[PDB]
């Protein structure tokens, strides 16, 4: 699910505020 992918990215410690932003926009694009 796309909701749970957003959540996992939000709790990913290896994502700084830059990388986390890119991760989400990537999920949202295909979601």
């Amino acid at each position: 699910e796309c909701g749970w992918r957003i959540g996992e990215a939000g709790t990913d410690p290896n994502l700084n505020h830059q990388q986390f932003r890119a991760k989400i926009l990537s999920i949202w694009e295909e979601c």
């Binding site: 939000g10 505020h17 932003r21």
Partner: protein, 142 residues
């Protein structure tokens, strides 16, 4: 990209009868200006924003009435008190067995500096906090 507003907050399991977003810096992302005030994300600069939120409802059974669950994201203009629904979603957990109704919301909108964003529900008495991290609310400046 390192200066673009980004925020990601999770719910507070210690709150009763509320969907309250944790403002503790130890578990709240508020970077590049965006801030959490009055349980609302505050837009620091004008532009396009992807706004999203997810809530998780759980129950132990099905009461007589079809308990309708709602989840909404609204905006409150910076210089006014008019709240406008931007996103919304309804579910019907029931049509003895536990149930689980996730409701996620998302979309890009043009926001103005100072605009206030709120993710709300109607029945906090069915909120769940066992999936800590999957009840969230965030914005991302495009």
């Amino acid at each position: 990209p390192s200066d673009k507003p980004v925020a990601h907050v999770v719910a507070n399991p210690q709150a009763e009868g509320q969907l309250q977003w944790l403002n503790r810096r130890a578990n709240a992302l508020l970077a590049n200006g965006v801030e959490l005030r009055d349980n609302q994300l505050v837009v620091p600069s004008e532009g396009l924003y992807l706004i999203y939120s997810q809530v998780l409802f759980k129950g132990q059974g099905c009461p007589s009435t079809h308990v309708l669950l709602t989840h909404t994201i609204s905006r409150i203009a910076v210089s006014y008190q008019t709240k406008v629904n931007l996103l919304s979603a309804i579910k019907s957990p029931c049509q003895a067995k536990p149930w689980y109704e996730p409701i996620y919301l998302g979309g890009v909108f043009q926001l103005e500096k100072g605009d206030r964003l709120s993710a709300e529900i109607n029945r906090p008495d069915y909120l769940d906090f066992a999936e800590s991290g999957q009840v969230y609310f965030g914005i991302i400046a495009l």
